[PDB]
């Protein structure tokens, strides 16, 4: 049996909320209806929050602009902790000049541009420049010819002893009510089905992003990890990750974990959320 609790009822226990984005705040057809009231509410209550997301397809500033376009003005770039920030820091620290090859769009790659390094798509790599490729990043499922560039990526990683990096996204994402699409994490998975495990994956259920947020909160208040709530739709990323780091966790049913499957999934993985809620929408 599941005890379903209202999200509003939980909020007084916590000094900060960590929200996953997809399946929690928004879905394939935009924001979940009413989700603005959640952020109005937290503001009115003076409650801190962050978005903690395994999206490295654009910068925090751009992720924040997408919410502003959808009308959620409360969410600023400083509130968005994304695994792309980890990737960027890893490249700056661990890659010594040359070229970083990427699978994705030019826009996805612009966030990573820096001094000393040239970003190039996999499509632009051949024998004439392969010796300068010092890393591979997988950023977005769109923006390149798969037949051409998945093939080239396989050969690039056979020929160059370099880090291959992706955000730990789900393997697929919902595109319509009926259809899913293969995500950038899934493109890595498919590559790894041919080559073996090979990708450094950043993001949940790792705890670096959580530690960053936690540290920033500790700079301005008394707070312990159990006084933070991680809110997510996915057991093996949001809930598992939150739990390992010591966060309380709330599973919402508006995403990857459907109500009919929750007990079964919880029982097969042994990943137990602190709380289960229908959704993160607070009714006005």
The contact set with Mg ion (CB under 5 A) reads: 20, 22-23, 233-234, 255
Q: Which of 234, 246, 231, 236 is nearest to 277 (CA)?
A: 231
Cβ atoms < 10 Å from Cβ of 49: 22
Q: Which of 202, 207, 266 is nearest to 241 (CA)?
A: 207
Phi, psi of 20 (to 5 degrees): -65, 155
CB 250 within 8 A of CB 229: yes
Nearest distance from residue 20's CB to Mg ion, in Å? Answer: 4
Q: Choose one: 7-15, 38-46, 96-104, 202-210; the region binding Cl ion (CB under 5 A).
A: 202-210
- Among its own copies, Cl ion, Mg ion, none, the one that 186 touches (CB under a kind-dependent 5 to 8 A) is its own copies
Beta carbon nearer to Cl ion, 3 or 161: 161
Quote the CA–CA distance of 156 and 103 in Å, as a whole number.
12
272 binds its own copies (CB under 8 A): yes
Quote the CA–CA distance of 56 and 169 in Å, as a whole number.
9
Quote the CA–CA distance of 184 and 171 in Å, as a whole number.
7
- Pairing state between β 275-277 and 248-252: parallel
CA angle 257, 273, 82 (to 5 degrees): 70
Structure tokens at 24: 């929690």
Write the interaction track for Cl ion spanning residues 104-143; mark x where CB under 5 A is met and - where it is not: ------x---------------------------------
- Among Cl ion, its own copies, Mg ion, none, the one that 151 touches (CB under a kind-dependent 5 to 8 A) is its own copies
Q: What is the largest distance, in Å, between two alpha-carbon atoms of the chain?
A: 62
45 binds its own copies (CB under 8 A): no
Out of 43, 97, 151, 278, the only residue in the binding site for its own copies (CB under 8 A) is: 151
Beta carbon nearer to its own copies, 13 or 69: 13
Write the interaction track for its own copies spanning residues 163-202; mark x where CB under 8 A is met and - where it is not: xx------xx-----xxxxx---x--xxxxxx-xxx-x-x
Give the residues lining the site for its own copies (CB under 8 A).
1, 89-90, 93-94, 141-142, 145-147, 150-151, 154-155, 157-159, 161-164, 171-172, 178-182, 186, 189-194, 196-198, 200, 202, 206-208, 211, 225-226, 240, 243-246, 263, 266-272
């Amino acid at each position: 049996g599941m005890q379903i609790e209202s999200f509003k009822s939980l909020l007084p226990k916590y000094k900060c909320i960590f929200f996953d984005a997809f399946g929690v705040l928004k879905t394939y057809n935009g924001l979940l209806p009413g989700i603005e009231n959640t952020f109005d509410y937290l503001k009115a209550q003076g409650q801190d929050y962050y978005i903690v997301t395994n999206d490295a397809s654009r910068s925090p500033e751009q992720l924040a602009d997408s919410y502003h376009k959808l009308g959620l003005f409360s969410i600023t770039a400083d509130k968005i902790i994304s695994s792309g920030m980890i990737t960027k820091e890893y490249i700056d620290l661990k890659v010594d000049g040359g070229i970083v090859a990427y699978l994705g769009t030019a826009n996805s790659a612009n966030y990573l541009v820096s001094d000393g390094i040239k970003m190039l798509p996999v499509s632009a790599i051949d024998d004439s420049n392969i010796g300068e490729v010092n890393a591979l990043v997988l950023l977005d499922d769109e923006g390149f010819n798969w037949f051409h560039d998945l093939n080239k990526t396989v050969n690039l990683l056979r020929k160059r002893t370099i880090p291959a990096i992706v955000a730990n996204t789900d393997n697929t994402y919902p595109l319509t009510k009926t259809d899913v699409a293969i995500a950038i994490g899934g493109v890595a998975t498919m590559i790894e089905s041919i080559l073996g495990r090979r990708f450094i994956r950043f993001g949940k259920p790792d705890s670096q992003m959580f530690m960053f947020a936690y540290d920033m909160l500790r700079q301005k208040m008394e707070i312990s990890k159990r006084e933070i709530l991680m809110v997510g739709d996915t057991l093996h990323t949001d809930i598992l990750g939150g739990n390992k780091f010591g966060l309380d966790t709330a599973l919402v049913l508006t995403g990857n974990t459907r109500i009919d499957d929750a007990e079964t999934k919880i029982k097969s993985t042994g990943i137990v959320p602190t709380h289960i809620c229908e959704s993160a929408v607070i009714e006005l």
